[PDB]
Amino acid sequence: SKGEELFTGVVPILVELDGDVNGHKFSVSGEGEGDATYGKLTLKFICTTGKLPVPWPTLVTTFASGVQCFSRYPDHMKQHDFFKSAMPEGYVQEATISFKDDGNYKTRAEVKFEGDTLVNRIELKGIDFKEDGNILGHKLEYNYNSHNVYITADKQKNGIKANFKIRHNIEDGSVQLADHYQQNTPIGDGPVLLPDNHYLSTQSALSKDPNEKRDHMVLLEFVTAAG
């Protein structure tokens, strides 16, 4: 595809988010770099309005979804890469994150190229949360486990669909369950690749910057496509 040639080296990344959870408004800014030949990514996020009203690990699926274009697809599987084929014009992404016995997050994002940089613009709305629960009560640990993302084609809208289950570790030893459901639609009127059923194997690591006093998060990720 024509969009594939834009990912042969190291490319800079820029992210911006605006949110509202149970009446509390906030804003986040991010910056980093990606190398698709090795399926490697490095990013740093900062809260520009003060302190974050929700735990940092609950926002990982929203941030990681916007950079799925940096996945390493093996030679025998290159005909199944929707993400790179839609570039430079891009796509619109809509999703729902449901927490068991608690509330939900509804999101919308624009992913495209501006110059020689890959850009992400996101909006989030959170409703029906419990004040004494695991989310608003800040009872989750600062970590994230390995998982698989399942993909399928959506012919009627010339795009794709994605789904997986999440397991968040709690302070007492137990876990908090969640589900992520997503849908992608192209912006331009050019050709795209429609895939057969497959998955993406992922591993992540969360850390802190020792010289930083503002509320933040550092993320490192490795992603590979498999049949």
Swiss-Prot record:
It comes from Aequorea victoria. Changing residue 154 to V: In EBFP2.0; shifts the excitation and emission spectra to shorter wavelengths and increases quantum yields compared to BFP. SUPFAM superfamilies: GFP-like. Changing residue 148 to K: Increases fluorescence at warmer temperatures such as 37 degrees Celsius. In Esmerald; leads to brighter fluorescence. In VisGreen; leads to brighter fluorescence. This is Green fluorescent protein. Pfam families: GFP. It comes from the Eukaryota. The lineage of its organism: Eukaryota, Metazoa, Cnidaria, Hydrozoa, Hydroidolina. Green fluorescent protein has been engineered to produce a vast number of variously colored mutants, fusion proteins, and biosensors. Further generation of mutants led to more stable proteins (at 37 degrees Celsius for example) with brighter fluorescence and longer fluorescence lifetimes. Changing residue 71 to A: Increases fluorescence at warmer temperatures such as 37 degrees Celsius. In GFPmut 3; highly fluorescent mutant when excited at 488 nm.
